[PDB]
Amino acid sequence: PIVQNLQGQMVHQAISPRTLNAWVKVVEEKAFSPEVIPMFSALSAGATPQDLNTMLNTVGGHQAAMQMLKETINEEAAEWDRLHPVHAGPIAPGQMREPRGSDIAGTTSTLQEQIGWMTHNPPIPVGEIYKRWIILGLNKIVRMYSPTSILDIRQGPKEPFRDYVDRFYKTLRAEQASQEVKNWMTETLLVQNANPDCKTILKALGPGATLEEMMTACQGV
Amino acid sequence: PIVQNLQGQMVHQAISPRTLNAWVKVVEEKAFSPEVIPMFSALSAGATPQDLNTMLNTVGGHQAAMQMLKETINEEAAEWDRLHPVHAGPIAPGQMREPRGSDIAGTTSTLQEQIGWMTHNPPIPVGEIYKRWIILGLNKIVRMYSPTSILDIRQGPKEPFRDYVDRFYKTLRAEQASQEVKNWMTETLLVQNANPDCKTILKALGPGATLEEMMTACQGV
Amino acid sequence: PIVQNLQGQMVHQAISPRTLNAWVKVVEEKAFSPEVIPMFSALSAGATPQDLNTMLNTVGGHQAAMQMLKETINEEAAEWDRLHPVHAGPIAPGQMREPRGSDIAGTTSTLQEQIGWMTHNPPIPVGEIYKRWIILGLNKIVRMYSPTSILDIRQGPKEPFRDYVDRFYKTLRAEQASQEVKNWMTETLLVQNANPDCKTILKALGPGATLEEMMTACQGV
Amino acid sequence: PIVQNLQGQMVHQAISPRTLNAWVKVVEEKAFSPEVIPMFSALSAGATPQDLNTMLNTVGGHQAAMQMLKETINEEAAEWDRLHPVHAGPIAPGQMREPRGSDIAGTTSTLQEQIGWMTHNPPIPVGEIYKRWIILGLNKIVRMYSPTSILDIRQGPKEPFRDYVDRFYKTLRAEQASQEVKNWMTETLLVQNANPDCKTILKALGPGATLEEMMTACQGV
Amino acid sequence: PIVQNLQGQMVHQAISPRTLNAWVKVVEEKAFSPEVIPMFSALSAGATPQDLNTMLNTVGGHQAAMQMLKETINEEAAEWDRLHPVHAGPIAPGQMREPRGSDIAGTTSTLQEQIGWMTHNPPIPVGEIYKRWIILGLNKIVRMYSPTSILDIRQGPKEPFRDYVDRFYKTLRAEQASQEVKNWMTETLLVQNANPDCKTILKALGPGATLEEMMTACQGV
Amino acid sequence: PIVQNLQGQMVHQAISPRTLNAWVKVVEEKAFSPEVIPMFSALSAGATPQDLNTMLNTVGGHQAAMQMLKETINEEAAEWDRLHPVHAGPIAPGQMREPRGSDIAGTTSTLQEQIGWMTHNPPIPVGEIYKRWIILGLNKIVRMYSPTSILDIRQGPKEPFRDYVDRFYKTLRAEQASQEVKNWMTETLLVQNANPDCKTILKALGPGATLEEMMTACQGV
Ligand SMILES: [Cl-]
Ligand SMILES: [Cl-]
Ligand SMILES: [Cl-]
Ligand SMILES: [Cl-]
Ligand SMILES: [Cl-]
Ligand SMILES: [Cl-]
Ligand SMILES: [Cl-]
Ligand SMILES: [Cl-]
Ligand SMILES: [Cl-]
Ligand SMILES: [Cl-]
Ligand SMILES: [Cl-]
Ligand SMILES: [Cl-]
Ligand SMILES: [Cl-]
Ligand SMILES: [Cl-]
Ligand SMILES: [Cl-]
Ligand SMILES: [Cl-]
Ligand SMILES: [Cl-]
Ligand SMILES: [Cl-]
Ligand SMILES: [Cl-]
Ligand SMILES: [Cl-]
Ligand SMILES: [Cl-]
Ligand SMILES: [Cl-]
Ligand SMILES: [Cl-]
Ligand SMILES: [Cl-]
Ligand SMILES: [Cl-]
Ligand SMILES: [Cl-]
Ligand SMILES: [Cl-]
Ligand SMILES: [Cl-]
Ligand SMILES: [Cl-]
Ligand SMILES: [Cl-]
Ligand SMILES: [Cl-]
Ligand SMILES: [Cl-]
Ligand SMILES: [Cl-]
Ligand SMILES: [Cl-]
Ligand SMILES: [Cl-]
Ligand SMILES: [Cl-]
Ligand SMILES: [Cl-]
Ligand SMILES: [Cl-]
Ligand SMILES: [Cl-]
Ligand SMILES: [Cl-]
Ligand SMILES: [Cl-]
Ligand SMILES: [Cl-]
Ligand SMILES: [Cl-]
Ligand SMILES: [Cl-]
Ligand SMILES: [Cl-]
Ligand SMILES: [Cl-]
Ligand SMILES: [Cl-]
Ligand SMILES: [Cl-]
Ligand SMILES: [Cl-]
Ligand SMILES: [Cl-]
Ligand SMILES: [Cl-]
Ligand SMILES: [Cl-]
Ligand SMILES: [Cl-]
Ligand SMILES: [Cl-]
Ligand SMILES: [Cl-]
Ligand SMILES: [Cl-]
Ligand SMILES: [Cl-]
Ligand SMILES: [Cl-]
Ligand SMILES: [Cl-]
Ligand SMILES: [Cl-]
Ligand SMILES: [Cl-]
Ligand SMILES: [Cl-]
Ligand SMILES: [Cl-]
Ligand SMILES: [Cl-]
Ligand SMILES: [Cl-]
Ligand SMILES: [Cl-]
Ligand SMILES: [Cl-]
Ligand SMILES: [Cl-]
Ligand SMILES: [Cl-]
Ligand SMILES: [Cl-]
Ligand SMILES: [Cl-]
Ligand SMILES: [Cl-]
């Protein structure tokens, strides 16, 4: 993170050991469940590309996902260099240079250069752009490591409707279904995969029924 | 949360890992017991709509309640757009725009826009309004997931009166009974569902008896 | 709690998750032992009526004691309204209004109104008065939930005198005995309920003996 | 504790939940071992008489020692009132009054009065004086609860000399032996209670031998 | 670490017990796994050579690696003295002297001298240079303590392809393979060491296939 | 520790409960292993003689080492009084007096006197000098409590060379061997106490071999 110096400068704030161990423990415990991506977005608030690389390098194991994530960063950095070409002549002494793709990734850039980009006015949010690339690669890792398909999420003859709905939207979240995909799935597959007794209840509920109405109705079955 | 910059600005304060792990652990341990709603109100003091969405997205599992909560937010945001219509012409450069329903929800708004709304004078408390919508949806989830009805809360022939009163008001709290409903329930059902020996004691106590008098009297049975 | 803003205002300070979980854990572990009341007085130092209601609402279970505590707050708020009647005409725009009983309880008052009362000069300590009502109700709950009477605290024929004195004053504290009641109980019941050998030792010690002299003398028996 | 307000006042700083739970846990775990008295002196650095009473009242159990400690405070407060008599006429409006014995104890004094005494120039260190009374009573409790006499600390025929010296000075510390008492005990009883083989080694070491020389010599036996 | 004094000086900030115990616990738990080197780089952000020596000396055990690390520091300090020779005449009173190799190591230098070097303008980053020597020695220790060769990382006939890729890049990271070495290893050895069914799938995928394409294809085998 | 007051004074900063419990737990767990001495040097950064005495007095047990440590402090304080004699006439009102040996030890000096010595210009570092005496006594305690001699550290016929080197330098550290003693021991005893197969490998390696070369060579045996 970046914090303002008491004299006036903008200095880099080290990652607290609390944030470090919290990150390595939620990865050790929950692996690549969907909820660890917003947790990574929370523990990396205001971080620089060097801070982001620090959090990612402290991960033990999961090196297959780390190399996949590194390939996604390289692709996004290449697209950035295509969209933001540099007229790189001789360097200007003491002036802010335009960041390349690898500069946003924090590999070919220094902590001072990253601070100067993020604290500029207008700021070049190299930390937020890099963080957006990491979220993109993490979404691909979570989707790939999704165990079950939505076709195999069917309510058992004695499973409570709320528990089957739990597995339903848990699978939809792992498969990176957007909110509209979840809405259309609520109108169709959720009713069509409920057990016979609940399915007749959900059909008699009528179209346009909300999730509160569907779960309250099938509470008795 | 929002904190004042030492130079003068109003900057966003990141959620501490302590607050994050405290929230995900009380949800993992207590699920949707009534006491986790005031705990959510405590851990989200002064938070922005982006901070609130961060706390809600870090929840693992319970995706049925999350989609229900998302439906309640959509309904309240639609009622807000009906009560506060916008005369949305061309945008004013560098000026504060009127927040829509989805802007209060933190989806179609940015962290800077939320800060500007909350730090304005008079403030547009988008964080408190969004937080009020979340409390409303959480109350519906707790009420739906209430296991027992108040009819099945009856004092056993050897259960202490205080323990039966514990289950009594615990069930009333889960079923979202207001304070007047609990007062009228104390005058009627609490006596009518006590075991025979305690019931005769509570009847001889006379009307208008307080809970201290009722629990002290049936202490011997 | 209330903390001074760096610009000059008096702003509300959110309850730390450390204070929250410390409160819910000492209630989960020790229930209504006498020592949890001073702990509640320590964890609620400088709190507002809204902060106090937050700590009390985060308690899981014990709803019988919570409703008893709520009845005691209502009684004390009614006595306050009798002792401090309001000449409530039309409201004065932008001026501090006189707090009623429910305003001290934090139900009919807002966080801004509570801050203005507590930060006034002279301050209207609505937080300390409300906290004094809560301590009063908590004392009634601890006294009611006291298991043993002082008559059944008698030194066994092989129990060390210090352990019997432990149970003695532990029972006296639960039954809300004041310091003079404990002093007179030390002169009388403590000697009269010691086992025969210690009782003869305590009688030969002479009147006006201190607790250090009584426990050192019966150390051999 | 007392901390300086940013505007200029001297305000009371609440006891952190870390300090509270640390105190109640070292008392729960170690009871009245000698090392808990310096720990109490460390966790109560700069505390007011109200903070000290808060830490002492949060102790669960050990009510026999608490009443003994309360008797010692009363004795020291009575000796203070004898050494510092007050010419208590009518009170001076807005002026600092002379603290009595019970005012130092924090019972007949308020937090504001204690702050004014401690922050005066020259300060009336009511917190340090009260803390000195508490240390005096705690020393009497630790000495009374000392299990073994120094006569029964004798080196076994196969116990390492360092372990017997451990029990030796551990017993001397519990019995409140000063440093000179420990020095004279090192010259005499420590050698006279070592097992025969070590005792002959310690005698041949010569007089005026240090503890390093005594423990290094008997390392082989 | 170094922090600015409120008056104006640059003072040394002590290592927090959180950072200390976090370092000694990740060494106790994970030994010399690759991820503990970036963790050491994170917990030592902004540290002085004295702070670095403190963190390294608090390590219990692993004294073989500690002496190896000490030999690597001596070699790098000797190369520094060769690249930066000093014209060491008489000392200049009150002036900053040129740091030698052992001065960067923090052995022949004091905390004040290290602060003056790091807080100078331009700064002599003795902490970052020393930290770079430590990372170099730690890399040699991790590489030496690597258990398996990449030749013995072969996918079992029933091991999921992602798990074999996990062991593959985990071994490559332990053997200090750079990113290009990992890229060329992905093109060659990763396919040539997959089990027969996956190997035929990876060959039919075509050249230039990414890790996401390789792991998604062999998901069925 | 000492911290600067916001008004301008230099005030004593209380030891945090984190630092206290961290010290008493590393002593409870690791006793007098060599690594607890640098840990004590880290947890006592910037401490006063009163803070140092507080940390040492909170130690439960190990009273044999505590009395040995107290004898070493007395010897060093006597040598200080010999090297720095005082011309102690009448005291100068309001002036800084020269510290004696017991004043550095923190027994015959007050917290205010210690602060004035440490915050003077030039400072009288009574805390660092006392801390240097404590490190000296702790080194004697660790050396005395060293279990094994270096003669009994011999590589087993099936022990990995790195593990035997671990026990080798672990024993050398406990016996307070300096770095040159460890270097000469690496050239001689380390090879002469390796098992026959490794010993022939280390002899064929040639003289002047480094620890990295010795451990990499004997990796196969
Ligand atoms: Cl920087
Ligand atoms: Cl941590
Ligand atoms: Cl999120
Ligand atoms: Cl790395
Ligand atoms: Cl750009
Ligand atoms: Cl940009
Ligand atoms: Cl995706
Ligand atoms: Cl069933
Ligand atoms: Cl599932
Ligand atoms: Cl259907
Ligand atoms: Cl259901
Ligand atoms: Cl159900
Ligand atoms: Cl912002
Ligand atoms: Cl945390
Ligand atoms: Cl609440
Ligand atoms: Cl999400
Ligand atoms: Cl509006
Ligand atoms: Cl509004
Ligand atoms: Cl509801
Ligand atoms: Cl029974
Ligand atoms: Cl129930
Ligand atoms: Cl009835
Ligand atoms: Cl009862
Ligand atoms: Cl009962
Ligand atoms: Cl406010
Ligand atoms: Cl917490
Ligand atoms: Cl109290
Ligand atoms: Cl509530
Ligand atoms: Cl009033
Ligand atoms: Cl008032
Ligand atoms: Cl009472
Ligand atoms: Cl017995
Ligand atoms: Cl009892
Ligand atoms: Cl009698
Ligand atoms: Cl006894
Ligand atoms: Cl006894
Ligand atoms: Cl105050
Ligand atoms: Cl705590
Ligand atoms: Cl002490
Ligand atoms: Cl009390
Ligand atoms: Cl006085
Ligand atoms: Cl005085
Ligand atoms: Cl004593
Ligand atoms: Cl033996
Ligand atoms: Cl003992
Ligand atoms: Cl003798
Ligand atoms: Cl021994
Ligand atoms: Cl021994
Ligand atoms: Cl310094
Ligand atoms: Cl710690
Ligand atoms: Cl890194
Ligand atoms: Cl060391
Ligand atoms: Cl240089
Ligand atoms: Cl340089
Ligand atoms: Cl390497
Ligand atoms: Cl299988
Ligand atoms: Cl492996
Ligand atoms: Cl091939
Ligand atoms: Cl796979
Ligand atoms: Cl698979
Ligand atoms: Cl002071
Ligand atoms: Cl602690
Ligand atoms: Cl060190
Ligand atoms: Cl002591
Ligand atoms: Cl001097
Ligand atoms: Cl000096
Ligand atoms: Cl030594
Ligand atoms: Cl073997
Ligand atoms: Cl060993
Ligand atoms: Cl040889
Ligand atoms: Cl080896
Ligand atoms: Cl090996």
- What would the DSSP string read from start to end of D126-184? HHHHHHHHHHHHHHHHHHHT----GGG----TTS-HHHHHHHHHHHHHHTT--HHHHHH
Cβ-Cβ contacts under 8 Å, D5 against chain C: 4
Q: From residue D138, give the alpha-carbon distance in Å to each of A78, B65, D69, D90, D176.
A: 71, 55, 7, 37, 11
The experimental technique behind this entry is X-ray
Nearest-neighbour CA in chain F from E127: distance (Å): 18
Rounded distance, CA A97 to CA E43, Å? 30
Nearest CA in chain A to B147: A219
Residue A2, phi then psi, degrees to nearest 5:
-115, 135
User: Could you state, in order of their start, the residue ranges of all structural domains in chain D?
Assistant: 1-149, 150-221
Identify the chains in contact with A, defined as 3+ C-beta pairs within 8 A.
B, E
What is d(CA A24, CA B22) in angstroms, rounded to the nearest whole number? Answer: 17
**C-alpha to C-alpha distances, B103 to A132, A183, B78, D164, E15, nearest whole angstrom:** 21, 20, 11, 74, 43
> Which alpha helices (DSSP H) does C119-195 contain, by range?
126-144, 161-174, 179-187, 189-192
CA-based end-to-end distance of chain C: 52
Handedness of CA B92, B94, B99, B104 (dihedral sign): positive
Instruction: Label the pairing between strands C2-4 and C10-12.
Output: antiparallel
State the nearest Cα–Cα gap between E204 and chain F, in angstroms.
Answer: 40
| Cα gap A177→A171, rounded to integer Å | 9
Q: Is A89 helix (H, G, I), strand (E, B) or coil?
A: coil
Q: Which candidate, E123, E198, E205, E138, places its Cα nearest to that of E168?
A: E198
The ligand with the least distance to the CA atom of A177 is: 7
Q: What is the dihedral of CA F110, F114, F115, F121, to 10 degrees?
A: 140
Here the tokens at position B109 are 């708004």
Element of type H or E holding B3: strand B2-4
Is A58 in contact with E46 (Cβ distance < 8 A)?
A: no
Residues B137 and B67: their CA atoms lie apart, in Å, by 10
CA B149 to chain centre: 20
Which positions in chain C touch B16 (Cβ < 8 Å)? 17
Give whole-number Cα distances, D130 to C31, D125, D158, E3, in Å. Answer: 31, 9, 47, 37
| C80, C126 contact by CB (below 8 A) | no
- In sequence order, the 6+-apart residues with CB closer than 8 A to the CB of C106 are C48, C49, C50, C52, C53, C114, C126, C130
In the block, which residue shows the tokens 């050998």? Answer: C197
Which member of A34, A39, A162 has the closest CB to residue B20? A39
Which residue of C lies nearest to D62 if distances are taken between CA atoms?
Answer: C166
Q: Looking at the DSSP assignment, which residues form a beta bridge with residue D3?
A: D11
Min Cα–Cα distance to chain B from C71, Å: 8
For residue E183, give the chain A residue with the closest CA: A67
B202 vs B218: CA distance, rounded Å: 8
Q: Return all residues near E38 (Cβ < 8 A) that are at least 6 apart.
A: A54, A57, A58
| B79 within 8 A of B87, measured Cβ to Cβ | no
A41 neighbourhood in chain B, CB within 8 Å: 54
Compare CB distances from A211 to B6, B61, B68 and report the shortest one's residue. Answer: B68
Q: How far apart are CA D60 and CA C32, in angstroms?
A: 11
CA atoms within 13 A on the CB side of F187: 7
3-state secondary structure of A180: helix
* The two three-digit tokens of residue E40, written as one number: 């050491």
Q: Which residues does chain E have within 8 Å of residue A54's beta carbon, measured at their own beta carbons?
A: 38, 41-42
Return the SS3 of D41. helix
DSSP H or E run through B2 = strand B2-4
In the chain, the amino acid numbered A55 is M
Beta-strand runs (E) in chain A: 2-4, 10-12
Backbone angles phi, psi at F3, to 5 degrees: -135, 150
**Angle at A13 (CA atoms; ends A8, A18), nearest 5 degrees:** 150
CA torsion through residues A75, A77, A80, A84, sign = negative
Q: Which residues of D touch C (CB under 8 A)?
A: 5-7, 14-18, 20-21, 24, 54, 57-64, 66-68, 70-72, 140, 144-145
State whether E35 and A54 contact (CB < 8 Å). Answer: no
Q: Which fold has domain A150-221?
A: 1.10.1200
Question: In chain E, what residues touch A57 (CB-CB under 8 Å)?
Answer: 35, 38
Q: Which residues contact F171 (CB under 8 A, 6 or more apart)?
A: F146, F148, F149, F150, F153
Identify the DSSP state of C218. Answer: T
Backbone angles phi, psi at D20, to 5 degrees: -65, -55
Alpha helices (H) in chain F, listed in sequence order = 17-30, 36-43, 49-57, 63-83, 101-104, 111-118, 126-144, 161-174, 179-187, 189-192, 196-204, 211-217
Q: Which helix (H) or strand (E) holds B165?
A: helix B161-174
AA identity, residue F142: V
SS3 content of chain B, % helix, strand, coil (to 5): 60, 5, 40
Out of D39, D182, D216, name the one closest to residue F20 (CB). D39
Q: Which residues surround ligand 28, an ion (CB under 5 A)?
A: B 38; C 57
Closest residue in C to D21 (Cα–Cα)? C22
F100/chain E closest Cα distance in angstroms? 26
Resolution in A: 2.5
**What CATH superfamily classification does D1-149 receive?**
Human Immunodeficiency Virus Type 1 Capsid Protein (1.10.375.10)
A42/B58 Cβ within 8 A:
yes
Please report how the helices A111-118 and A126-144 are oriented relative to each other, as an axis angle in degrees rounded to 10. 100
Interchain proximity A14–E45, CB inside 8 Å: yes
Tell me: cis bond preceding B99? Omega within 30 of 0 counts.
no
Region for B123 from its dihedrals, namely left if φ exceeds 0, alpha if ψ lies in -120 to 50, beta otherwise: beta
- Distance CA(F168)–CA(F159), nearest Å, equals 13
One-letter amino acid for residue D53 of the chain: N
Show Cβ contacts of residue B5 under 8 Å, excluding neighbours closer than 6 positions. A4, B11
Sign of the CA dihedral running D205, D208, D211, D213: negative
